[PDB]
Design an enzyme around this catalytic site. Sequence first.
Site, mmCIF file in Angstrom:
data_model
loop_
_atom_site.group_PDB
_atom_site.id
_atom_site.type_symbol
_atom_site.label_atom_id
_atom_site.label_comp_id
_atom_site.label_asym_id
_atom_site.label_seq_id
_atom_site.Cartn_x
_atom_site.Cartn_y
_atom_site.Cartn_z
ATOM 1 N N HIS A 39 -11.998 44.867 24.966
ATOM 2 C CA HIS A 39 -12.803 46.082 25.033
ATOM 3 C C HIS A 39 -13.705 46.259 23.817
ATOM 4 O O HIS A 39 -14.309 47.327 23.659
ATOM 5 C CB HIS A 39 -11.909 47.313 25.216
ATOM 6 C CG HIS A 39 -10.990 47.576 24.065
ATOM 7 N ND1 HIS A 39 -11.433 48.056 22.851
ATOM 8 C CD2 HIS A 39 -9.648 47.440 23.948
ATOM 9 C CE1 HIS A 39 -10.405 48.196 22.033
ATOM 10 N NE2 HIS A 39 -9.310 47.830 22.675
ATOM 11 N N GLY A 141 -9.143 52.686 14.537
ATOM 12 C CA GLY A 141 -9.547 51.484 13.838
ATOM 13 C C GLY A 141 -8.451 50.451 13.680
ATOM 14 O O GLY A 141 -8.690 49.415 13.052
ATOM 15 N N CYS A 143 -6.960 48.913 16.264
ATOM 16 C CA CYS A 143 -6.925 48.024 17.418
ATOM 17 C C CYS A 143 -6.965 46.568 16.969
ATOM 18 O O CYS A 143 -7.655 46.213 16.007
ATOM 19 C CB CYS A 143 -8.098 48.319 18.355
ATOM 20 S SG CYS A 143 -7.964 49.877 19.259
#
Lengths: 299, 300
Positions: A39, A141, A143
């Site tokens: 993503h 942040g 991920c």
Amino acid sequence: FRKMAFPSGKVEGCMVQVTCGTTTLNGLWLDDVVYCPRHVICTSEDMLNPNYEDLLIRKSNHNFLVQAGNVQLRVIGHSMQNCVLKLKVDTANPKTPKYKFVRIQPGQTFSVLACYNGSPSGVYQCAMRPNFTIKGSFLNGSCGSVGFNIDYDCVSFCYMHHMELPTGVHAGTDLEGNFYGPFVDRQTAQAAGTDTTITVNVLAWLYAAVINGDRWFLNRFTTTLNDFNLVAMKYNYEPLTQDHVDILGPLSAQTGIAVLDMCASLKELLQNGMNGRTILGSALLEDEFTPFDVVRQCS
Amino acid sequence: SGFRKMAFPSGKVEGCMVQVTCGTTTLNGLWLDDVVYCPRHVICTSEDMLNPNYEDLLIRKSNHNFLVQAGNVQLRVIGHSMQNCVLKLKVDTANPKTPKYKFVRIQPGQTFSVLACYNGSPSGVYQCAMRPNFTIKGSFLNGSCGSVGFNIDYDCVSFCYMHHMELPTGVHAGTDLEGNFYGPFVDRQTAQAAGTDTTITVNVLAWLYAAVINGDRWFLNRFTTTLNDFNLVAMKYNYEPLTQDHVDILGPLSAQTGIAVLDMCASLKELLQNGMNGRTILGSALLEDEFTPFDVVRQC
């Protein structure tokens, strides 16, 4: 008796920063490949109903910025594998350790290296909850943060952070990208199931208390598997199995307390509470210590 | 919700851990530049621990009596000197993995990460706090002596603790990196009594201030209290007395929110007398006192 995480040294040298447009998250740099959630190629509007296969074809190699400290990696190819992006770079990672890709089951534990913009900032020990989520401390942040276990010389990567649920728990995939639990990488309303307590881990934690000389909860009674499970489901506890009894075998033979004997002690702690008492310093029954963790930590 | 107890990454500290062997005793050491730091109770035998004469023992030792091992590479000892309770082993080769480092002495209530090692090999890392009785509640089995505690700021590592003793109750004691002990403890195998372990009041208040920022308010009340009256009640629950210095440190936390510090103390006083009633604060069923106000102000 503390909840210890694995040393993070071998994983710190692999974390990188991946940027596509205005989106930046963490990547896993091993050999000449950088792994990150897919993503990263989605704007804030594509996340509603993204067609990743259509989105990836439009993108090109120069659309990805990969940064390893101040060194800049150059992307020569991209590929997708089940919600995980694979970016091929021109330089192999010289700090690549002996690594393996494994998929874990709910109830198992591992350490997580929390990162922010490709920079490690913290490490903690957690367990895969039965609802296929993890209770961690991630902030916007984080991920692409990975979970791992360490053998003698081999690092086993088993988790990559993908999403944060509204309840505060987080969901992710393995390094081959298969999601843990019924989740999709889309910005929509998703719910995690009822989180139950890992009974096998509680028993291993009770054995560790007996090893540490805290044995006030022992009683003269034993019980049966079907009697205990009926009570266990009532208080939202995972049903015990024959396999669980065999995993606890070494701790039973060492302490002399049978699994079903200890089960009667746990059966009392739920119905009647802890009677103003503590175990291992806690008034709560911990369930994030696997039996293998107890064996390593106590021995 | 969710406020996990995170520890600092251990990568920079993993490359500084070595194995020091003297006679039949082996423990961990810290390798910075060309100096190796380790507890001085390594020239001791089991019998020497009752009444050790460290000056007598060290004068009888030579450089070749100390074996220093960094993985497979054996370090050669070229000099040795004793500073307080720590041994400084001068070696021929400086550590190429030496990070930017400092030595600091911490006060009770401050937090740091611990890298537990066994014979120069790290095995786990955890986050902890220095208790008011100058002890630490960690998991240290035999052979973990020489493990260090540290904080990481920017790219600078601050070593603040080295493990020496285990103590009868199971809570460990140690020194700073200059060999000065934390608390009244000594490196003897004598009956040493730790003080009563009290809850760190300022850490709880900072933790509660972070809860209202995250949306938890069920413990709030309309009452306020004075500093003297709160310490009278907090003493009954074995809580550390609050000082004026603690009030100012919580200032910014009480500035982002509308709750005054003494306003929060009344809420804390009500929590102690009532309990949780099955509820949770930031996903925790108990009051946390191992989060410093500094750690809460940053990343608030």
